[PDB]
Paper text:
In this study, we characterized a thermostable endochitinase (Chi23) that can hydrolyze both crystalline and colloidal chitin. Chi23, from a marine bacterium Pseudoalteromonas aurantia DSM6057, is a member of the subfamily B of the GH18 family. However, different from other modular endochitinases of the subfamily B, Chi23 is a single-domain enzyme containing only a catalytic domain. The catalytic domains (CaD) of GH18 chitinases adopt the classical (β/α)8 TIM-barrel fold with a conserved catalytic DxDxE motif.
Residue numbers in the entry: 2 to 278
Write the structure that this text describes.
């Protein structure tokens, strides 16, 4: 199983992650400028400017990588507009080249596609979101081959519900799941999954059985603290004993993701979770 975290807030120095039991750190975020959607800009504690990492970030990445940890840039995030994606969907190869260049020029291990434009799975966004994610994944994987590079996505549970109205990622995994390393499923901000372990477990198992998916390719994601999500916080003892152990009893568990690194005091959360894996 793998342990994954997102780094957006800088309240805890990034280099602290190099001494904690994380396998993957997603730097959040790279996203479209309001100006021109094909110009990608950085946000969060990683950014010295819109186009550059801070000095401390650059060093922390090297130290993490020396430890055998993988560091991805997360593209997207919750604040990226559907209108920017609509434009990008008309030239995914150009977007892929920009992302691949950012990964290579900053010596990263790949990309996390944190895509949250739900309306593009319901016919309300003026572009086909599933075909966008399918094409973007193919073009990115062309430029960032396995197994040297990682491509993850971060879907929300409705995206993966067979037969659902917003199940865009069912189509995604059916067409290009073999090219995706794993899914960081956000079991938060999404009723009725939020803080509902029984529903999280049954859905997790269903997702591992989608075409091209497996336990290894599905990571269960949670907020560290109450302030990390509008809904879905659960104490770590509940995650362990009502999510992790029930999944381990029936299948295997690809891993645990959290939002977000700087909310975890002294790394206690990841230490307890890791232990349980």
């Amino acid at each position: 199983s793998k342990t994954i975290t997102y780094y957006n807030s800088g309240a805890v120095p990034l280099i602290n992650a190099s001494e904690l039991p994380y396998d993957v750190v997603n730097l959040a975020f790279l996203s479209s400028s309001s100006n021109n959607p094909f110009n990608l800009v950085l946000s969060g504690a990683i950014a010295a400017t819109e186009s550059s990492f801070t000095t401390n970030t650059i060093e922390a990445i090297k130290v993490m990588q020396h430890k055998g940890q993988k560091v991805l840039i997360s593209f997207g995030g919750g604040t990226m507009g559907s209108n920017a994606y609509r434009s990008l969907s008309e030239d995914t190869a150009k977007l892929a080249d920009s992302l691949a260049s950012f990964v290579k020029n900053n010596q990263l291990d790949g990309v996390d596609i944190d895509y949250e434009d739900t309306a593009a799975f319901t016919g309300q966004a003026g572009y086909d979101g599933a075909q966008f994610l399918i094409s973007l994944t193919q073009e990115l994987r062309k430029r960032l081959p396995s197994p040297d590079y990682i491509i993850s996505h971060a879907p929300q549970p409705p995206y993966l519900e067979q037969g659902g109205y917003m199940a865009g990622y069912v189509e995604v995994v059916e067409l290009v799941g073999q090219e995706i390393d794993w899914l960081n499923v956000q079991f938060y901000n999404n009723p009725p999954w939020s803080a509902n372990p029984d529903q999280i477990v049954s859905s997790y198992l269903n997702y591992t059985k989608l075409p091209n998916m497996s336990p290894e390719k599905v990571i269960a994601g949670f907020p560290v603290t109450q302030n990390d999500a509008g809904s879905g916080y659960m104490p770590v003892q509940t995650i362990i004993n009502e999510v992790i152990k029930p999944i381990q009893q029936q299948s295997s568990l690809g891993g645990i993701m959290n939002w977000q690194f700087s909310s975890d005091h002294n790394g206690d959360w990841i230490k307890a979770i890791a232990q349980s894996l």
